[PDB]
UniProtKB/Swiss-Prot annotation:
Membrane topology: Multi-pass membrane protein
Coiled coil: none
Cellular component GO terms held in the UniProt record: endosome membrane; membrane; plasma membrane
Protein name listed in UniProt: Sphingosine-1-phosphate transporter SPNS2
Length: 414
């Protein structure tokens, strides 16, 4: 039973993990007005955070594979909670301290997205492990929704972003204490050389990279796209999208778990096929989103709802594939390398590239509001291509999943 309590506490930890990510991005307009900084600094905040995460991911992965995956995780929790609360103090004249604090949160936050999945895989190993991983990666929609919900609520309560950056750290420190208490006590060069020869894991990592590309581009451009659609058609969109994303992620993880359970009764390849059967499907509805931008009066872009439901589904099935195809001593490094390759090719390169494409299309022709909306749509047409490539790489994972699962099980046996 204490494994269920440990899984619940790690789920809450992940909730605070993601709520501490989008808190500095749901109130970014107020921070931009406060420090006198411009769009360059607004991008720089999350850019330095992501680069810090990608620097500190392999190191914490290797450390977790080495020694005491629990104290590292609790120390990371305590670190970024204490760092965010301290960053709340930061005056107006000092912006590079805020940038440095986001960098330190990035360092200290690679010890939860790359270490907690290993503990979850070590607690349960069955369909209940799939259920607990569904909870842990449903904490991702919940974090990404409550981030904007809290960012709006705090400015509805007081005229500060300081409360947005102060409300979470106390609960994060409480979660650190409970992680340290209620979680039971469960070469690198050669390991990494042996993680690229794993074809199932390689193609699953590519699929996750494509998923992250899609999520990043859509999340940082769709609100402005719908705003331009309203402008040509003739604030609250933040909370609307946050609530939509939260409920849709609930629905998506439920759909993914149900489809995996109903499809595992037919073939051994029900983990890497079903995601593709969703992902391609998601891509299809993504295209309809743009059509929904033309005449949102009848159907108010519910294709966002459907595509997000079919896309926020594979987060836990990717973790299941990883736990199947990677032996328990290499799991922390496998997750760390997967996250490094994901965020290198994903949500750190999606919004900037989409903006560059939009700039090229807008500069190609004389500017007009209808042309702005059309240029953004033509630039976001690239997202379905990446989702389709993610589906194709999930099928490529399906080709070798059974072989790699058998090999991993054999090596685990001895």
């Amino acid at each position: 039973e204490k494994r269920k309590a440990a899984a619940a506490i790690l789920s809450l930890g992940n909730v605070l993990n993601y709520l501490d990510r989008y808190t500095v991005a749901g109130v970014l307009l107020d921070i931009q007005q406060h420090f006198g900084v411009k769009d360059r600094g607004a991008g720089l905040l999350q850019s330095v955070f992501i680069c810090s995460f990608m620097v500190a991911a392999p190191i914490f992965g290797y450390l977790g594979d080495r020694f005491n995956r629990k104290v590292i995780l609790s120390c990371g929790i305590f670190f970024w909670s204490a760092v965010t609360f301290s960053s709340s103090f930061i005056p107006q004249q000092y912006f590079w301290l805020l940038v440095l604090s986001r960098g330190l949160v990035g360092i200290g936050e690679a010890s939860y997205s790359t270490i907690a999945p290993t503990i979850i895989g070590d607690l349960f190993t069955k369909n209940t492990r799939t259920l607990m991983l569904s909870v842990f990666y449903f904490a991702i929609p919940l974090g990404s929704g409550l981030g904007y919900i809290t960012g709006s609520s705090v400015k509805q309560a007081a005229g500060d972003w300081h409360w947005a950056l102060r409300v979470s750290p106390v609960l994060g420190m409480i979660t650190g204490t409970l992680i340290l208490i209620l979680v039971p006590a469960t070469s690198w060069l050669r390991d990494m050389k042996a993680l690229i020869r794993n074809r199932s894991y390689v193609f699953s990592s590519l699929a996750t990279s494509a998923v992250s590309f899609a999520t990043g581009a859509l999340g940082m451009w769709i609100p402005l796209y719908l705003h331009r659609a309203q402008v040509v058609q003739k604030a609250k969109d933040s909370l609307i999208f946050g609530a939509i994303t939260c409920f849709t992620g609930f629905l998506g993880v439920v759909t993914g778990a149900g489809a995996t359970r109903w499809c595992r009764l037919k073939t051994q390849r029900a983990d890497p096929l079903v995601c593709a059967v969703g992902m391609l499907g998601s891509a299809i509805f993504i295209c309809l989103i743009f059509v929904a931008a033309k005449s949102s009066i009848v159907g108010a872009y519910i294709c966002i709802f459907v595509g997000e439901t079919l896309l926020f589904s594979n987060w836990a099935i990717t973790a299941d594939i990883l736990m199947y195809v990677v032996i328990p001593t290499r799991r922390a490094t496998a997750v760390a390398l997967q996250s490094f390759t994901s965020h290198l090719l994903g949500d750190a390169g999606s919004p900037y590239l989409i903006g560059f494409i939009s700039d090229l299309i807008r500069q190609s022709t004389k500017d007009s509001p209808l042309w702005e909306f059309l240029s953004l749509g033509y630039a976001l047409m690239l997202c379905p291509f990446v989702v389709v490539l993610g589906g194709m790489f999930f099928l490529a994972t399906a080709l070798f999943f059974v072989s790699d699962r058998a090999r991993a099980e054999q090596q685990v046996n001895q």
